[PDB]
Symmetry: D2
Subunit: 292 residues, 4 copies
C-alpha cells in the first residue's frame, strides 16, 4: 500500500521525477500528486475523515479528483494581497485534517504576515545584539495615520504582504514619501519602512534539514562561516522549527551587514546546485513520511 505525497508548487518542477523509486522503510512506494494552491480544495472532519480535491478547471478538459494525501510539501506562498490569492483557509483545512507537512502547517500559517515573521527576528536581534545578529532597522505601521516622515532617505516602503518584489517602493524624499503614505491608506493594510542600504552585494544563507549553503548575489556559492550559520540556525528555530529556510542579508559598502528577512519552505532554489537542493528536500520529506 503506497504513501501519497501532495506537493503544492507551480508546474515548473517535476517532483514526481526526483521522488521516483524512493521508498519508505525500503518497502512502501510514494505516489507524488502535484498541484498549485489555486487548484485544490478540501473538507475536513474532526473525526479524521477528509478529502483533498484537485483541479476542476485545468488540463484534461475539466476533471474533479479526490486525494487522501498522507503528507504535504509546501513549496508555494500561501497568501498574497495581489496576484496569488488567499490560501490561508486551505492551510487551516490541512491542519484541521491533521496532515503532516514540510514546512509545518503551523509555520506556513504563521508565515502569512511578513512583519509577523519579522517580529520574530526582532526578538532574536534584541537577544543576540547587533554584533551577533545585524537586523536592518525596519519600522512597522499597523495603520498609515502616523506615517509622517522617515528619519532619513531614501526609504524602502514594503506594503502589506507581497512577495518577489511586489509592493515595494523606493522613496527618495519627504514629499514622495507622503504620496506613498496616501497610497498606503488606500490599501487598508499595514506596511513597513526601512532605510535604503547602498549594497556591495546580497547574501542568502540557506538551511535544508542539516545542509547549509551560502550564495552571493550582486549568484556565486561562498563559504559558510559560524556567523552565517548562527543567523540561519537561529532563524530556523522560529514557529517551532523550519525544515527548509534561508536568511537574506545585504552587505553594505559601509562594511556592516544587514539581515533583511527569512523565507520558508517556498524559498526559491537558486544557484547551480539546484538538483542537490531538490534531492535534499526529497530525502528530508521521505524521512518525515517514514517517521510519521
Amino acid at each position: 500500500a503506497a504513501r501519497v505525497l501532495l506537493v503544492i508548487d507551480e508546474p515548473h518542477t517535476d517532483w514526481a521525477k526526483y521522488f521516483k523509486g524512493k521508498k519508505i522503510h525500503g518497502e512502501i512506494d510514494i505516489k507524488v500528486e502535484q498541484a498549485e494552491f489555486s487548484d485544490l480544495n478540501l473538507v475536513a472532519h474532526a473525526n479524521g475523515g477528509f478529502s483533498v480535491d484537485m483541479e476542476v478547471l485545468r488540463n484534461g478538459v475539466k476533471v474533479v479528483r479526490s486525494l487522501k494525501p498522507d503528507f504535504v510539501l509546501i513549496r508555494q506562498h500561501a497568501f498574497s494581497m495581489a496576484r496569488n490569492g488567499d490560501y490561508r483557509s486551505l492551510v487551516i483545512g490541512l491542519q484541521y485534517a491533521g496532515i503532516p507537512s514540510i514546512n509545518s502547517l503551523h509555520s506556513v500559517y504563521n508565515f502569512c504576515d511578513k512583519p509577523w515573521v519579522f517580529a520574530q527576528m526582532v526578538r532574536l536581534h534584541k537577544k543576540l545584539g547587533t554584533e551577533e545578529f545585524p537586523l536592518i532597522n525596519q519600522t512597522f505601521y499597523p495603520n498609515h495615520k502616523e506615517m509622517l516622515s522617515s528619519t532619513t532617505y531614501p526609504v524602502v516602503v514594503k506594503m502589506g504582504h507581497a512577495h518577489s518584489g511586489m509592493g515595494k517602493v523606493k522613496v527618495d524624499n519627504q514629499h514622495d514619501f507622503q504620496d506613498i503614505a496616501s497610497v498606503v491608506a488606500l490599501t487598508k493594510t499595514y506596511a513597513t519602512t526601512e532605510p535604503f542600504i547602498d549594497a556591495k552585494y546580497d547574501v542568502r544563507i540557506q538551511k535544508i534539514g542539516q545542509n547549509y549553503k551560502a550564495y552571493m548575489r550582486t549568484l556565486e556559492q561562498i563559504a559558510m562561516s559560524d556567523r552565517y550559520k548562527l543567523w540561519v540556525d537561529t532563524c530556523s528555530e522560529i514557529f517551532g522549527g523550519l525544515d527548509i529556510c534561508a536568511v537574506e542579508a545585504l552587505h553594505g559598502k559601509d562594511g556592516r551587514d544587514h539581515i533583511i528577512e527569512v523565507v520558508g519552505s517556498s524559498m526559491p532554489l537558486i544557484g547551480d546546485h539546484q538538483d542537490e537542493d531538490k534531492q535534499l528536500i526529497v530525502e528530508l520529506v521521505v524521512n518525515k513520511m517514514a517517521q510519521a
Copy 2:
C-alpha cells in the same frame, strides 16, 4: 520609576481599581492604562523604539496620548468579520515592539481564526481519544463549493470568525441548508458545520494560572474532576501555553459529553465569583511583570 500596564478591554471593568496598591517586587508601582483595541495605534522599530497611541476620538473632546506599555493584558477579541474589526495588525505591532503579554501575543494572533484554534483540539482529540477528550464532530469548509449535505439534521453552521453567537445558524433540513450554503458563498470565507446537540446543560471549565473553576449553565459552580481538569489542562497547552482560558462543553441528554471550543484571555468572566477571577488575573499579571 513605575511600571505601565496597558489593558485592552471594554470600559465595563475598572482594571485600575483591582491593580491599585499592587507593587512589583514590593517596590515598583503599576500605572494601569485601559482602552479598547479601536482606540489604540502604534509604531514599532526593530531597534526597540516604539509608542502606543491612545484615543484620538473619545471622551475628553479629542486627545492624542502616547504610552510606552511595559506589559499588556488582552481581555478583548482581536478580530471579527463583523461588529468588532480587524486588530490583527495591532497584535503584530505589539509583537514587533517586543511587549510582554497575557495571553501571549503569539496565542492571541493564532486565536484569530476559530477553526485554526479548533484544529489544535482535533490533534488532541486524535491523540487522547473520545473516552478521554470527547470533541464534537465538526466539519471545516475552506470554501462553500462542496457544501452539499450534512450527514444529519439539524446542523449548526458557524460562519467565518464570529464571537458571542454571531454568525451561527441552526439549519433543520436539506433545503434550508442549501440556502445557507449560498449565503456562505457570499461571505467569501470558510465556515464549519456540526451536528446539533440536544443538551441537558452546558459546562465551562476555566483555568487562570493554576486556579480551576467549573460552572454549569442550563450558572452554578460545580466540582472539578480529573476529566474536566484534563480537558482544560490539555487545551491550556496550545500555542505555547494559555495563561487564561476555558473549555466549553455540552452535556447531551444522550449522556455523552461534547467539547465545543476553547476560549483565550478574552474569555468572559462568569458566575458569582467574578471578583475572585479578577483578583487572580491581577496576581498573574503582576507576577509576569516582575519576572519580565
Copy 3:
C-alpha cells in the same frame, strides 16, 4: 566501495541485531554495519573537538581481544546501572554523550534512568497533575537512606533497594520488627530505598510504545488498547525529553482497580509473541533516526 554507517548496539548476545538490520539502507543508498557488545566490554575516549573512539573487548574465546570502532549511532538495549559489582556504566553513557553520538533512547534519558526513584519522581508529577482517576500511580515512599525508616503506615509492604532490577532487590516485609531488619540491610547498601503497599494482584498489564506502535499485554495475552492505557504510556513517553521505546507496568489488584508501578526505557524486555515484529519496529525506528543525523 562506499563506507557503511556504523551502528553500535549495546545488548547481551541473545539477540542477533545484525540479522534484523541486514539489507536495511539509509536513504536507500548507504549501508549499515552493526557492531554489538555489552556495556561491560566497552571503553572510550572522547574529545571536545569531536574526536573519539569506542573500543570493544568482548572476551569471547579470544583473551584480551580489543577491536576498535567508530559508531555513528547507538541503540541501548541494556540497563546502564546496578548496585552490584560491575554495575556502573554511567561514565560510559557520559562518554557517549561527550562524544556527541546520537542514540535510542536518547543518552539524556538513559543517564536519567540510572536512578529508578528519579524516574518515579517524574510519574509522581504526572500523577499529581492528572489525578488518580486518570493516572492511578501506586502510593510509593522514597527514603534517601535507612535513617528515617522507623515504620510504614501499612504492612505488608514491598521494600525495593537502591538499584536492583529484573524483580531483584525486592523484599516483602510483614511486620514492624521484620521491617527494622530490612532497614539495617538498607544501611548496609549505603543507598536509598522505596516501600509501597503490597498489592495482592489479579493480573499484570504492560503497555508499550515503540515509536508510534502500541501494544498491551496481560499477565501472556495481548489485550486491546484503550484510551486510558494509551494516556498512561503517552504521558510516560514524554519524560526526560521523550522516550522512543518505553512501557508502563501496572497491576490490576484483586481489589478491582489499576495501579501504575513503573516505566521502563529502551532496555525494556521484548515480550509476548510479537518479539520479532517489535525488533523490526525498533530497526525501522533506528534507521530513520540514522538518516536524520
Copy 4:
C-alpha cells in the same frame, strides 16, 4: 495569624538568607519563613501521594537536634556532590524531586549537574553547533576511567579527577611518565577524569546570569558585557531545561584568545563587589517563583 510560606535554603552558614528575605511578601500578602541548613544536615521521606517531611539536624551547639520542617520552595546554593567522604547528596535531590518541591535552580538541573563532564558534554554540543568563532570551548578529553590513559597529545596538561571542585582534584602533569603516575591515581578513584591542554593565562573572565541580570568580572574588575559574552552565558543558561542562576568561566590565554572552561549552576559563588545586589536579585527571583507556584 495566617501561615507563612516556608523557604528552605541549602547553603553553608556564611550567608544570612533570612535577612535578605525579611519583609519580602508573596502577592504583597503572604509572609516567608526562611529555614537554612546544609545538605549534610538533612534527611527526608517522600510519598507519591504528596505527603513528605524535610527534617533538619544542624548540630550547632545542641547534640542530636532534629527540627522538622515542610518547605514550600528550595534555593540550592550548595554543590550537591563530591568524590570525598560525605559528598553525595544526590539521593536528597532525588527525594526533593520525589516530593514535588519547586526549586532554584530546578531539581532536574541540580541532579544533572552532579557529573561535571556530563555538564561539559552539553557545552560540547553547543560548541559543535556554534563553532569556535562563536563559542570557543577548550579542547578537553573525557576518560570514563584510567584504562585508556596511555598518553595525551600535548603536555603540560591539566588532569581533573572525577568529582572535585573549588579548583581541587586538579593536577598539572608535564610529561609522559608523570602522566602515567596520575593515571594510576585515577584508577584508585574508580571514577572518570578529564585532561585539557594547559593554558598559560593572562586573565580569567566569569560571565554570570541571574534571572535577566548579567555581570562580567575579570581576574576583580567588572568589565562591560558584550554580545559575545552574552551569547556564551545565554546559551549555557538553556541547558537542562534552563538555569536561573549560572555563570560561564573562560580564560583569556597569553595567546590572545578566549577559552570556555565550564559553566556553574545555582551554587556558583557570588564574587566581586556586587555580592549583596546579586543576593537581592536571587531574593527577587525566588520570591517571584514562589508566587507562581
